[PDB]
Amino acid sequence: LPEDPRWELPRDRLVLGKPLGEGAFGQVVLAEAIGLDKDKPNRVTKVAVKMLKSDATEKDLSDLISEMEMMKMIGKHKNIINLLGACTQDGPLYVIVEYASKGNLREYLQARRPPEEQLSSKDLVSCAYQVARGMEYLASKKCIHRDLAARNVLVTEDNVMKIADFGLARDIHHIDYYKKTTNGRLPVKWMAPEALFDRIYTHQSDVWSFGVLLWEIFTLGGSPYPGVPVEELFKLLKEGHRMDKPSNCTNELYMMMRDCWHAVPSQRPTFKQLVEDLDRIVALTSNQE
Numbered sequence: 001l002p003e004d005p006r007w008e009l010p011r012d013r014l015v016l017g018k019p020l021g022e023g024a025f026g027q028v029v030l031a032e033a034i035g036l037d038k039d040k041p042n043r044v045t046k047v048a049v050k051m052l053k054s055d056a057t058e059k060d061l062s063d064l065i066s067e068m069e070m071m072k073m074i075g076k077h078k079n080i081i082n083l084l085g086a087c088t089q090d091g092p093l094y095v096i097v098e099y100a101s102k103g104n105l106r107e108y109l110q111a112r113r114p115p116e117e118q119l120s121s122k123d124l125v126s127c128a129y130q131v132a133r134g135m136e137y138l139a140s141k142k143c144i145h146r147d148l149a150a151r152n153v154l155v156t157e158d159n160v161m162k163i164a165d166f167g168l169a170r171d172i173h174h175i176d177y178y179k180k181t182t183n184g185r186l187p188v189k190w191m192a193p194e195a196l197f198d199r200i201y202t203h204q205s206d207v208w209s210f211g212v213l214l215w216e217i218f219t220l221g222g223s224p225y226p227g228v229p230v231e232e233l234f235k236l237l238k239e240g241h242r243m244d245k246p247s248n249c250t251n252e253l254y255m256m257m258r259d260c261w262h263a264v265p266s267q268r269p270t271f272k273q274l275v276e277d278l279d280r281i282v283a284l285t286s287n288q289e
């Protein structure tokens with residue numbers, strides 16, 4: 001691998017630890033990095049580190065490299081998982097990124113269902129706002145996520161939402177529609193119809209996904225279309241079926257979901273608009289329940 005002084009960290013500055021993400025994101029571990037920022041060489045920073053597996057092919061390597069290079073191009077934002085460094089010389093590839101100590105957004109929501117303090121209505125809307133901001137940023141940098149979902153949003157120690165796994169151009173025609181997530185759910189249930197049927201991925205189809213994620217948030221981690229298999233989902237979408245309004249969700253926010261699921265992609269809102277709408281809604285939403 002060619003060295004890149006912008007990002008290189010000597011690998012003896014890294015203390016490796018336990019796995020993260022239950023394999024969903026490949027081999028990612030928690031680590032401690034000494035002197036990440038060279039201004040404070042004596043501080044340690046908890047970071048996430050992604051690396052190849054033992055039984056890994058040549059393209060597994062090129063993919064990890066592409067992922068890293070992509071993250072370099074995209075630049076930094078508060079509501080995405082940022083690149084922090086790399087170990088590329090004299091050993092196996094390490095990609096060093098921000099650590100989100102509270103796991104993914106689906107888990108985090110579920111753990112705060114009534115029987116871990118319950119979330120206020122304002123908290124929930126604020127969660128939506130942060131995810132829209134990260135996506136607004138990524139879209140502005142010409143990045144299409146293709147798998148936006150609460151499982152790919154990570155939460156920091158300070159309850160900041162970060163979009164994860166935006167760096168890989170995953171093998172588009174090559175996707176297993178029947179393959180389930182780590183949780184046992186079907187990723188097709190987040191996909192816009194034109195992405196699912198015509199394999200056309202855009203910022204507009206990411207917005208569809210965001211509507212489903214919105215529905216995840218206000219159901220506190222609910223599973224979309226529970227019990228519905230792939231073939232039946234296809235039929236549902238061909239018919240123009242839409243998920244019902246969650247309880248404890250305003251008509252305004254349900255209308256937002258429905259707009260994100262506009263049958264005509266050009267008519268869906270942009271992440272720019274969603275951020276603006278969500279920003280106003282936050283300021284009017286009570287945190288007293």
Ligand SMILES: CCN1CCN(c2ccc(C(=O)Nc3[nH]nc4cc(-c5cccc(OC)c5)ccc34)cc2)CC1
Pocket residue numbers: 020021025028048049050067068081095097098099100101102103104107154164165167
């Ligand atoms: C109450 C019980 N809780 C306790 C906390 N716990 C968890 C669970 C999971 C995490 C976690 O995965 N954190 C992560 N932070 N940053 C992360 C980056 C990637 C990542 C992804 C793609 C590409 C990449 O590099 C190129 C990296 C992955 C995972 C990451 C933390 C706490 C759950 C249960």
